[PDB]
Amino acid sequence: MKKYTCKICGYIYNPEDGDPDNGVNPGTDFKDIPDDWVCPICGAPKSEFEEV
Ligand SMILES: [Zn+2]
């Protein structure tokens, strides 16, 4: 699985780390994150993300 980054702020979603505080377990491929999840830094939607 690949890392994704927020086009707005530069946050990196690392699938090996997930975002567990917001319910995204380690091992979650970006496509599988629930589509109401937002960037934990700037609040951007998934649609603003891209592969590193
Ligand atoms: Zn962001």
Author numbering: 1 to 52
What do the authors say?
Chimeric hybrids derived from the rubredoxins of Pyrococcus furiosus (Pf) and Clostridium pasteurianum (Cp) provide a robust system for the characterization of protein conformational stability and dynamics in a differential mode. A structure design algorithm was applied to the rubredoxins from Pyrococcus furiosus and the mesophilic bacterium Clostridium pasteurianum (Cp) to generate chimeric proteins in which the predicted hybridization interface can preserve each of the interactions in the parental structures. Interchange of the seven nonconserved residues in the metal binding site region between the Cp and Pf A2K rubredoxins yields two complementary hybrid proteins that are accurately represented as a sum of segments from the parental structures. These "cut-and-paste" models match the ultra-high resolution X-ray models to within the structural variability exhibited by the crystallographically nonequivalent molecules in the unit cell.
The coordinates for residues 1–6, 12–38 and 51–54 from Cp rubredoxin were combined with those of residues 7–11 and 39–50 from the Pf protein, to yield the metal binding site-swapped Cp hybrid. The metal binding site-swapped Cp rubredoxin crystallized in a P21 space group with three protein molecules per asymmetric unit, as earlier observed for a V44A variant of Cp rubredoxin. Refinement was extended to higher resolution with inclusion of heavy atom anisotropic temperature factors and all hydrogen atoms, to attain a final R (Rfree) factor of 11.2% (12.5%) for all reflections out to 0.79 Å. The rmsd values for the backbones of the A, B and C monomers with respect to the original search model were only 0.22 Å, 0.24 Å and 0.27 Å, respectively. Molecules A (green) and B (blue) are appreciably more similar to one another than is either of these structures to Molecule C (black). Molecule C diverges most notably from the other three molecules at residues Pro 45, Lys 46 and Ser 47, for which all backbone and sidechain heavy atoms differ by at least 0.5 Å from the superposition with any of the other molecules. Note that the direct interaction between the Lys 46 and Asp 35 sidechains that was predicted in the NMR analysis is indeed observed in the crystal structure. A clear difference between the NMR and X-ray structures occurs at the Glu 50 sidechain, for which the χ1 dihedral angle is 175° in the NMR-derived structure but near +60° in the X-ray structures, despite the fact that the 4.9 Å charge interaction with the Lys 7 sidechain is preserved in both cases. The metal binding site-swapped Cp rubredoxin analysis at 0.79 Å represents the highest resolution Zn2+-form protein structure reported to date. Given the marked similarity in Zn2+ and Fe2+ binding site geometries observed for Cp rubredoxin, the present structure may offer a useful model for the reduced active site as well.
